[PDB]
Design a protein around this ligand. Sequence first.
Ligand SMILES: [Ca+2]
Length: 381
Amino acid sequence: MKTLSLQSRAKTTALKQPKEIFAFARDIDGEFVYDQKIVKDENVSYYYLPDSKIDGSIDLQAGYAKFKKIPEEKNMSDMKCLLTALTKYEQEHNNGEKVNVDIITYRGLMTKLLALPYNLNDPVDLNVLAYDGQLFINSDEEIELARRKEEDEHKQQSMTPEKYDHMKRCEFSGYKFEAIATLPKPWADCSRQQIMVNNYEQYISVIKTGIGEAKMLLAGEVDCVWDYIPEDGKDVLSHYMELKTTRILESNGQVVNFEKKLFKTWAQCFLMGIRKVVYGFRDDSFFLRDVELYKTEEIPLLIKNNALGKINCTTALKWYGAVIEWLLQEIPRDDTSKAYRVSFDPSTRTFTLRELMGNENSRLRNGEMLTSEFKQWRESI
Ligand SMILES: [Ca+2]
């Protein structure tokens, strides 16, 4: 049970340029797509939102009843599909050799670590295991499942039916916005009818990146493309976009709320190499009132210069660098007999690394994180 100081900072931010090496997707029917040409031909959305229809006429809550919601049991809580795609990549594009990184994980999990210093009320629990000279990092399914139910219970005990329903519609409005702001294909290739709202569709980019001395593989969802996907697969990340929604800023409190949202959005995009974010601003009746395009690199200065402890993107990044370095130093890379858990506890404000002693290792190495298909492949090399 080792701990890391919450004031830990890396010497420099030590940045590296990320690059996508492969992608996979879950389509609108819950099926997974792994072919590289197919996924970019059929599972990519394209940004299209005329300034004409940003006049307060569009209700982001309209059609809430026809929301196609995936049951949260099946929402990639494991690493199965990621490892399926990674296996394919190593077989077909890495000459049958393992990808050359130290860490393999999801973008969202790293965002949690990166945003931690200014979100000390949010618990973090990550399973870490060493395999084939690499660290695999995932959230814990049973913990996530239990934490998800407890948070819903709290909401039900603290919210009226009206406010609870309002929350659900806020969630829906984000997916609604993505639907009305994107096209299945470029304009020229679309019908005029095109010119279900769901959370099934997920386009997952997988990038090689890093920080400091660490080389990392991050899998992260991408909302859409700003213009086009280049054919030679070069600098593809620079064409991706992120789509977000939030309430219009009509008070100081909401500006504070937005700055905290904008910071998490920056973290999300920065780790992934996403250079563009679009925020849709809605009123209480969910009508789309305004839109704003952000360059990811301009957000840290926006936050710092805001006339409202104080969120610092550079500080957060230095903390992130210290954490990654700590994990690679404290977890033996060649011991495959153990499993570890990194945990941040809000009530004690402690950041701990510990060896799991309940034989969680057995389940993690046989389904939840490592899969039989992936292990056999790595063994065969
Ligand atoms: Ca989004």
